Amino acid sequence: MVISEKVRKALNDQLNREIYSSYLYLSMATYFDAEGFKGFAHWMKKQAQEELTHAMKFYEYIYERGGRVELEAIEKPPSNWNGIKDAFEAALKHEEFVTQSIYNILELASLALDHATVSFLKWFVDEQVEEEDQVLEILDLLEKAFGQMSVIFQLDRYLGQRE
Amino acid sequence: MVISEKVRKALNDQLNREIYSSYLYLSMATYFDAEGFKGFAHWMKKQAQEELTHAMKFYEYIYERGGRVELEAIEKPPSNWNGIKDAFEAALKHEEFVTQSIYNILELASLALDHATVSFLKWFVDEQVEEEDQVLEILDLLEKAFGQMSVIFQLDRYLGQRE
Ligand SMILES: [Fe+3]
Ligand SMILES: [Fe+3]
Ligand SMILES: [Fe+3]
Ligand SMILES: [Fe+3]
After folding, report:
1. Out of A19, A45, A71, whose CB is closest to B79?
2. What residues bind Mg(2+) 5, as annotated (chains A, B) (predicted)?
């Protein structure tokens, strides 16, 4: 049941990356709140909470497999963006990086014939598709506002509904 | 309604200190989980969640008062302690530092005649008393185990009950 160290290290690295992800989304919330979009800010706070659930999934899996977690320093995230689109494009680029990190754990797990970790990671592959899809949809809806503040505010209301 | 910058900065500093507090308690959880005390680890995870509620209280108060939040880098917390007592003594020392930081905001708020911030901080003064009390009680119960593993495990079970 004991997990290989190279896979352990990769999962611990990912845990720390999910923590930074949470912090980055909270920083995007600080931007939207300062720009007066409480709905966009709400969506970001929810996303920050979701990223913490990802981190704790990795946390508890590592201990299930006999490893231990070492928390690393969290870098200072950006706190400003040149507009709503710029913020969500930054979120999409961030998620693309997370997705490629997940595939690297998948590669290391299979090289170790660690099918338990391969199975564990399947949820995260599906979740990355979902999260990229949601960010693409927001970018699409924003593009289709064609700069009209009436539409942009209705989008703020919509994203403010996130459960 | 707009808050003074020196008080704004003090609240933003405290927000960042509550974030580190959350991270420190999660790190204590990683220690207890590696030592096989899932009840102690549970208590630490709950405390980490509580510290995030403190941080978000500061977050939303700053925006209520017309300020903005800037998130700073989170330092790497310690991840090892020389035993259960050592961990909780570290938590007590950490909370003592948080408490003196809260009083410094109180001083700056009153110098600005910012009674709104004085009122806001009253909950945190009471919460620090509560948190110091809980850590002192755990240290007392641990001391009274007199090294007996039977009692120490029942304490793990008790702390594992935290809602
Ligand atoms: Fe994630
Ligand atoms: Fe994500
Ligand atoms: Fe606190
Ligand atoms: Fe505290």
Report:
1. A71
2. 86
Give alpha helix (H) positions in chain B. 5-34, 38-64, 84-111, 115-143, 149-159
**With the CA atoms of A128, A134, A137 and A141 taken in that order, what torsion angle do they form, in degrees rounded to the nearest 10?**
-150
Give A157 Cα–ligand 2 centroid separation in angstroms.
22
Chain B residues at the A interface, defined by Cβ less than 8 Å, are 19, 23, 26-27, 30, 33-34, 45, 56, 59, 63, 68-77, 79
Q: How far is B43 from chain A (nearest CA, A)?
A: 15
d(CA A40, CA A153): 10
Cβ B32 vs Cβ B41: under 8 Å = yes
Structural tokens at position A89: 């494009």
Cβ(A27)–Cβ(A9) under 8 Å? no
3-state secondary structure B47-61: HHHHHHHHHHHHHHH
Resolution (angstroms) stands at: 1.8
A74 secondary structure, DSSP code? B
Q: Which residues surround ligand 4, an ion (CB under 5 A)?
A: B 131
A99 is written with which tokens? 């997705």
